[PDB]
Structure formats: structure tokens, C-alpha cells
CSV table of C-alpha atoms in Angstrom, one decimal:
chain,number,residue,atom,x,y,z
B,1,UNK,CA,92.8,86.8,98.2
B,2,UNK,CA,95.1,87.9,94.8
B,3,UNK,CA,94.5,87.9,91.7
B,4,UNK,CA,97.1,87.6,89.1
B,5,UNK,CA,97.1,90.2,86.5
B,6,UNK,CA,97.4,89.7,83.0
B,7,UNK,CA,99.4,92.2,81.2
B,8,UNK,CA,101.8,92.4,78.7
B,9,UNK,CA,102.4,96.1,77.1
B,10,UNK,CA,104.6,97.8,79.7
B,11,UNK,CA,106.6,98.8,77.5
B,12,UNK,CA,107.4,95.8,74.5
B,13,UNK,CA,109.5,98.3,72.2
B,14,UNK,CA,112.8,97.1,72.7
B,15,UNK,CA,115.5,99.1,74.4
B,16,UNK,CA,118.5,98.7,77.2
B,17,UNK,CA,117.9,98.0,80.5
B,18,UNK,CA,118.7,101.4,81.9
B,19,UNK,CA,116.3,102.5,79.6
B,20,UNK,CA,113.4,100.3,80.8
B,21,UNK,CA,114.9,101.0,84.4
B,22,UNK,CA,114.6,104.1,83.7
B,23,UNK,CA,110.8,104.0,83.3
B,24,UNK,CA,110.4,101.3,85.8
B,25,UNK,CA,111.4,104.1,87.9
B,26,UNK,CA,109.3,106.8,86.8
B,27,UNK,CA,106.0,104.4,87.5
B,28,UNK,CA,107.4,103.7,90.9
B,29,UNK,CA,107.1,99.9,89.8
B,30,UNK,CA,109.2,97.7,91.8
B,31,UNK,CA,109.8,96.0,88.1
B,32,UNK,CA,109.6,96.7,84.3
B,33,UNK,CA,109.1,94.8,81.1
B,34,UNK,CA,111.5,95.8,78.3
B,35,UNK,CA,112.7,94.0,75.5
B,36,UNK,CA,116.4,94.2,74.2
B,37,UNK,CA,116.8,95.3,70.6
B,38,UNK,CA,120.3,93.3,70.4
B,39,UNK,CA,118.5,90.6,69.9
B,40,UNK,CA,115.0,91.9,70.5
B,41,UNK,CA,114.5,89.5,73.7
B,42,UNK,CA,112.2,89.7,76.4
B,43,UNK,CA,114.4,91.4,79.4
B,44,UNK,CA,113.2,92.3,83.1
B,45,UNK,CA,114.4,95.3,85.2
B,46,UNK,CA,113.9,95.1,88.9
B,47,UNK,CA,114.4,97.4,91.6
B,48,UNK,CA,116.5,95.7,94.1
B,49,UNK,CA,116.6,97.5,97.5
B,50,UNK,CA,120.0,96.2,98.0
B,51,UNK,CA,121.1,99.5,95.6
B,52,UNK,CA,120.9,97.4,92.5
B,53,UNK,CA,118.5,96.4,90.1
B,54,UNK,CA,117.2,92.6,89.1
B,55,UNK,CA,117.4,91.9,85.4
B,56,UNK,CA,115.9,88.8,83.9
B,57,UNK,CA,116.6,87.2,80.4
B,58,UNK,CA,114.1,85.2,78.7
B,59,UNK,CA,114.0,84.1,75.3
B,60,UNK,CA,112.3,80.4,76.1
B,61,UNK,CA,113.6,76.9,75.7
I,1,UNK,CA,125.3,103.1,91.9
I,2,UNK,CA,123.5,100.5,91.1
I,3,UNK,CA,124.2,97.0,89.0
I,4,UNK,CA,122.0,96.2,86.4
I,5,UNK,CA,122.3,92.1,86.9
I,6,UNK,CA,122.2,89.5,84.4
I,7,UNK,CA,120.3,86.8,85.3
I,8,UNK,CA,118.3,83.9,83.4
I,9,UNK,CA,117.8,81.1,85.8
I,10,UNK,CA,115.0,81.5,88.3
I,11,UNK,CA,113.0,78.9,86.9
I,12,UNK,CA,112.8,78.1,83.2
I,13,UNK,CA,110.5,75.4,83.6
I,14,UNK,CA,107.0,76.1,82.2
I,15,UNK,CA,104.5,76.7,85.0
I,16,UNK,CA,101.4,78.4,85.7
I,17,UNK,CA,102.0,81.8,87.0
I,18,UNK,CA,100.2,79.9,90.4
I,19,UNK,CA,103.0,77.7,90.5
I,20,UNK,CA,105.8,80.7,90.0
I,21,UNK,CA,104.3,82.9,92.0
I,22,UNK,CA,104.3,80.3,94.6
I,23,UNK,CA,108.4,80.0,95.0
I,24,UNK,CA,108.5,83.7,94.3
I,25,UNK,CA,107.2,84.0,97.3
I,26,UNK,CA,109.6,81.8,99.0
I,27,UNK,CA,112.4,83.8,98.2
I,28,UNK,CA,110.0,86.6,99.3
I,29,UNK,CA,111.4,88.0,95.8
I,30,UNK,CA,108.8,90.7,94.5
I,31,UNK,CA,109.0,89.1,91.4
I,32,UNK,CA,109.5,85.7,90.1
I,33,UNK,CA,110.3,84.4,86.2
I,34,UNK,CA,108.4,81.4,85.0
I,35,UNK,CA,107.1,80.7,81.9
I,36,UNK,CA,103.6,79.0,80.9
I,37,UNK,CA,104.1,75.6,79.6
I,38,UNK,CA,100.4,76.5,77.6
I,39,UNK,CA,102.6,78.1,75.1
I,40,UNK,CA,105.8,77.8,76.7
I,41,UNK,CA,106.4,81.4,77.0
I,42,UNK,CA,107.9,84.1,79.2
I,43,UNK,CA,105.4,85.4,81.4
I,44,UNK,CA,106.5,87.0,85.0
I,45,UNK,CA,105.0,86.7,88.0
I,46,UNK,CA,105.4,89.7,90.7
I,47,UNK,CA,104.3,90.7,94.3
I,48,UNK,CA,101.6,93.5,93.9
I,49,UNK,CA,101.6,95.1,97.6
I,50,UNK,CA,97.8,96.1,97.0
I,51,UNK,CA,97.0,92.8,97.2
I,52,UNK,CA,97.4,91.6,93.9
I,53,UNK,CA,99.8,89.9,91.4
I,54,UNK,CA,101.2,91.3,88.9
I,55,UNK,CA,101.9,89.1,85.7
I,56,UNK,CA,103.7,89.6,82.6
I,57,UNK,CA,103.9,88.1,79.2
I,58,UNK,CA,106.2,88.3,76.5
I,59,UNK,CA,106.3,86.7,73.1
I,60,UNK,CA,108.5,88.6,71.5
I,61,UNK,CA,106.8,91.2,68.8
């Protein structure tokens, strides 16, 4: 049975993606929170296995 | 080389991290973007191999 964990400070500083990629890589994690200081948005690095990496946009509705 | 990819749309729709997780795992993505109509914020859902979920949130600072 999971649980889903709550946790928001990965890291909520905001910088590029490679940079949070960068990190998301150093904890092994298969994703990383970072936020964008462009506009200082909530952005998600991924690690896709396909050689890429996943990067999600939010900044709500 | 990888591709850092820009992509918004997984589903914008406010839903319980349940609900996210849910289709996330019927992409058999490791992760999943929702965001909790509670507050109608960002919050990610992702597949924690331990046996777990792991689930962001961001606000924004």
C-alpha cells in the first residue's frame, strides 16, 4: 500500500532547468522541483530514460 | 545529449494527488502533474519505487 508524500522544499529558489536537473541528478531522483526566476514559476525536471529530461510548467489556471 | 522539454499539459484540472497519481500511472509515467482543486495549486504526483509516492507542491514563494 503507498502513501503519497507531502513535500514541497526540493529546492523552491528559482533557477533554470539544467540547473534543477542538475541536482535532480545528484539525488539520483527520477524528478526535481525547481522554480524559474524568469518569471519565478513552478517548473519540473524529469529524468527521461529515453536520453531526455521531462520538464513541466505550472503556474495554475 | 539530452532535451530539456517544455511541457504544460498533463492535466491542469484540479484533482487530488489520488486522482493524478491514478492516470500517472496509466502512462506508467514516474511522475504525473495535477493540481489540488483545495487551493487550486500545482502539486505533483510521482512513482516512488520504494513503494511510496512522491508528491510535490508549489505555490510559488
Amino acid at each position: 500500500m503507498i502513501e503519497i508524500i507531502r513535500s514541497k522544499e526540493f529546492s523552491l529558489k528559482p533557477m533554470d532547468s539544467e540547473e534543477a536537473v542538475l541536482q535532480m541528478n545528484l539525488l539520483g531522483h527520477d524528478f526535481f522541483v525547481f522554480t524559474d526566476r524568469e518569471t519565478d514559476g513552478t517548473s519540473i525536471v524529469y529524468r527521461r530514460k529515453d536520453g531526455k529530461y521531462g520538464l513541466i510548467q505550472t503556474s495554475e489556471q
